[PDB]
Design a protein around this ligand. Structure first.
Ligand SMILES: CC(=O)N1CCC[C@@H](C)C1
Length: 165
């Protein structure tokens, strides 16, 4: 087929950091890939633009996607509020993996995370659906504004986002 590609233009307290692009595995997880793709373009009237990465843990991951409450408690999918775990075919093999954040089985909304390391303990618990294609240096830069518990030292936001391919 043709896995779509989306981008995020990251900012720190408004100051431009850089662009990160992701390939979405629509071929393996079509429903999960579509949710992220649609939220990246904002076609449903809501999405990632303007939202922040509320939890960043060095050597672990960068979490974001809460465009409703903006603190890790909200966010919503394009299929209503929450949707089921599609499948656990793909694993958290290393840095760059794009996966779904959740509050337990079948509670996928809009929140997601970018791994900065292999996180195999999350395999079978979080739906992996994409991977960073370009701008891993920017993800590594974001990681420097995080902390051990996850609280960020500065506001890391998605200044702009959309579809590339
Ligand atoms: C609860 C949840 O979805 N997440 C995202 C992945 C890393 C976890 C510590 C938190």
């Amino acid at each position: 087929m043709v896995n779509p590609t989306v981008f995020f233009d990251i900012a720190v307290d408004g100051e431009p950091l850089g662009r990160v692009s992701f390939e979405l595995f629509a071929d393996k997880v079509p429903k999960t890939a579509e949710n992220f793709r649609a939220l990246s373009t904002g076609e449903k009237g809501f999405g990632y633009k303007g939202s922040c990465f509320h939890r960043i843990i060095p050597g672990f991951m960068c979490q974001g996607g809460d465009f409703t409450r903006h603190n890790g408690t909200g966010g919503k999918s394009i299929y209503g509020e929450k949707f089921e775990d599609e499948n656990f075919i793909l694993k958290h093999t290393g840095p760059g993996i794009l996966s779904m954040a959740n509050a337990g089985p079948n509670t996928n909304g809009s929140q997601f995370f970018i791994c900065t390391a292999k996180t195999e303990w999350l395999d079978g618990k979080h739906v992996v659906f994409g991977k960073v294609k370009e701008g891993m240096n920017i993800v590594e830069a974001m990681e420097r504004f995080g902390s051990r518990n996850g609280k960020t030292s500065k506001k890391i936001t998605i200044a702009d986002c959309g579809q590339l391919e």
